[PDB]
C-alpha cells in the first residue's frame, strides 16, 4: 500500500453491545455492569432477566434527568438503580430497538441520554449501550438466563 485506498466496511458498530459481551461482563467480579429493560410495567411483569434491573417506559421522557426515573421506579429497583454509578459499564434491553433504530423520542434513547448527557452528580465511565435486539433477542441467546421463557411476541403484522 502507499497511503490507503476507500473501500465499503461492513463492521462498524457503535454505541452497541451484543449478547456475547454482556455474558462475559455478567459473570465479572472485577467489571461490574447493570441490565436495565426501557419497556412497559406489563412488560417486565410477563417477562423479566434475572439479576437484572427494570424501567417503566411512561416514566421516561425524552429530555429528562436522573431525578426523573428515581422518581418513577419499582420499590426493588430502586436499590440497583442507585448502584448505576458504582458499577463500571451499563447496558439497557428492548422487544424491537436496536442502537441503529434509536430515535427522538424512543425510551432507550431518552434514557440512553438521561444518565451521561443529562448527568449533574452521579457519573458512568462510559456511554449506556443497547443490547443487540434485546430480551426479544436475549431469549434466542440464552433462554436460560430468565425468569420467563415462554413468551412470544410476535410483530405488528
Same mark, same amino acid.
Given at each position: 500500500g502507499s497511503s490507503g485506498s476507500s473501500g465499503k466496511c461492513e463492521t462498524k458498530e457503535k454505541g452497541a453491545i451484543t449478547a456475547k459481551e454482556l455474558y462475559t461482563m455478567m459473570t465479572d467480579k472485577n467489571i461490574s455492569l447493570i441490565i436495565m429493560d426501557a419497556r412497559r410495567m406489563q412488560d417486565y411483569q410477563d417477562s423479566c432477566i434475572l439479576h437484572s434491573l427494570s424501567v417503566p417506559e411512561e416514566a421516561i421522557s425524552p429530555g429528562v434527568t436522573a431525578s426523573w426515573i428515581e422518581a418513577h421506579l419499582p420499590d426493588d429497583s430502586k436499590d440497583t438503580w442507585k448502584k448505576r454509578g458504582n458499577v463500571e459499564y451499563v447496558v439497557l434491553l428492548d422487544w424491537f430497538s436496536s442502537a441503529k433504530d434509536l430515535q427522538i423520542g424512543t425510551t432507550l434513547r431518552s434514557l440512553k441520554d438521561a444518565l451521561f448527557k443529562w448527568e449533574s452528580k452521579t457519573v458512568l465511565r462510559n456511554e449506556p449501550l443497547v443490547l443487540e435486539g434485546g430480551y426479544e433477542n436475549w431469549l434466542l441467546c &440464552?433462554?436460560? &438466563? %430468565? %425468569?420467563?421463557?415462554?413468551v412470544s411476541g410476535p410483530s405488528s403484522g
Open positions: &440464552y433462554p436460560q &438466563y %430468565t %425468569t420467563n421463557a415462554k
